Each structure stands twice: as structure tokens, then as C-alpha cells.
């Protein structure tokens, strides 16, 4: 009754929040895959060094 | 006959000398790394996790 356009503004704000949160979710997943590849990469690198540590 | 033989054979040996000379200038550094990696070659792998 009193906050009709106010709640419309809230609807817009939550829509923007949904957009930013989707970008966060997506980009964090992207970085998760990135980090996992580089983690397993250097992991196995350490494993090879951990097994046959050169002179 | 002999003229062609001596000239051509001399050129052959000259180019062979060129070959080995440039190879000296471009490969002489290998034995250092060879000795290095021979010392590094001690490898044995057993994946404990596998």
C-alpha cells in the first residue's frame, strides 16, 4: 500500500543480484576448473620430483 | 681425368672439413650436458598410491 514502487525497485535490485550472482557462480566454476587443472598439474610434477629428486 | 679427380676430391674434402668445423662450433657443448644428465639419470618409480 505504501511501498509499491519501493518493492518494484527491490525487484529490480534482486534481478541485478541474480545477474551478478550468476556471473559469480559461473566464473567461480571456471576458476575451479582452472585451479584443479593446475593443481593436478603441479601435483604430479611434485610427485615426479618427490620420486626421483635429481642431484 | 686426374685433373677432375684431384680438383673434385679436394673440394669434397674441403666441404667435409667445413661440415665438421661447423659441427664443432655447434655441437661441442653437448658432452657437458651429457655428463650432467648421466648423473641425473638415477630414476626408479613405484606409485605408492596406485
UniProtKB/Swiss-Prot annotation, chain A:
Q: What is this protein called?
A: DASH complex subunit DAM1
Q: How does it assemble?
A: Component of the DASH complex consisting of ASK1, DAD1, DAD2, DAD3, DAD4, DAM1, DUO1, HSK3, SPC19 and SPC34, with a stoichiometry of one copy of each subunit per complex. Multiple DASH complexes oligomerize to form a ring that encircles spindle microtubules and organizes the rod-like NDC80 complexes of the outer kinetochore. DASH complex oligomerization strengthens microtubule attachments. On cytoplasmic microtubules, DASH complexes appear to form patches instead of rings.
Q: Which gene encodes it?
A: DAM1
The compartments listed are:
Chromosome, Centromere, Kinetochore; Cytoplasm, Cytoskeleton, Spindle; Nucleus
Q: What does this protein do?
A: Component of the DASH complex that connects microtubules with kinetochores and couples microtubule depolymerisation to chromosome movement; it is involved in retrieving kinetochores to the spindle poles before their re-orientation on the spindle in early mitosis and allows microtubule depolymerization to pull chromosomes apart and resist detachment during anaphase.
Q: Tell me the protein family, please.
A: Belongs to the DASH complex DAM1 family.
Source organism of the structure: Chaetomium thermophilum (strain DSM 1495 / CBS 144.50 / IMI 039719) (Thermochaetoides thermophila)
Curated annotation (Swiss-Prot), chain B:
Q: Does the keyword Cytoplasm apply?
A: yes
Specify whether Cytoplasm is a keyword of the entry: yes
A cellular component annotation (GO) from this entry: kinetochore
Q: Which UniProt keywords apply?
A: Centromere, Chromosome, Cytoplasm, Cytoskeleton, Kinetochore, Nucleus
Instruction: List the subcellular locations.
Output: Nucleus; Cytoplasm, Cytoskeleton, Spindle; Chromosome, Centromere, Kinetochore
What processes in GO biological process is this protein linked to? Answer: attachment of mitotic spindle microtubules to kinetochore; attachment of spindle microtubules to kinetochore; mitotic sister chromatid biorientation; protein transport along microtubule to mitotic spindle pole body
Which family is this sequence assigned to?
Belongs to the DASH complex SPC19 family.
Give the record's subunit note. Answer: Component of the DASH complex consisting of ASK1, DAD1, DAD2, DAD3, DAD4, DAM1, DUO1, HSK3, SPC19 and SPC34, with a stoichiometry of one copy of each subunit per complex. Multiple DASH complexes oligomerize to form a ring that encircles spindle microtubules and organizes the rod-like NDC80 complexes of the outer kinetochore. DASH complex oligomerization strengthens microtubule attachments. On cytoplasmic microtubules, DASH complexes appear to form patches instead of rings.
What is the protein's known function? Answer: Component of the DASH complex that connects microtubules with kinetochores and couples microtubule depolymerisation to chromosome movement; it is involved in retrieving kinetochores to the spindle poles before their re-orientation on the spindle in early mitosis and allows microtubule depolymerization to pull chromosomes apart and resist detachment during anaphase.
Q: What is this protein called?
A: DASH complex subunit SPC19
Please state which portion of the whole protein this structure contains, as first and last residue out of the total length. Answer: 7 to 56 of 173
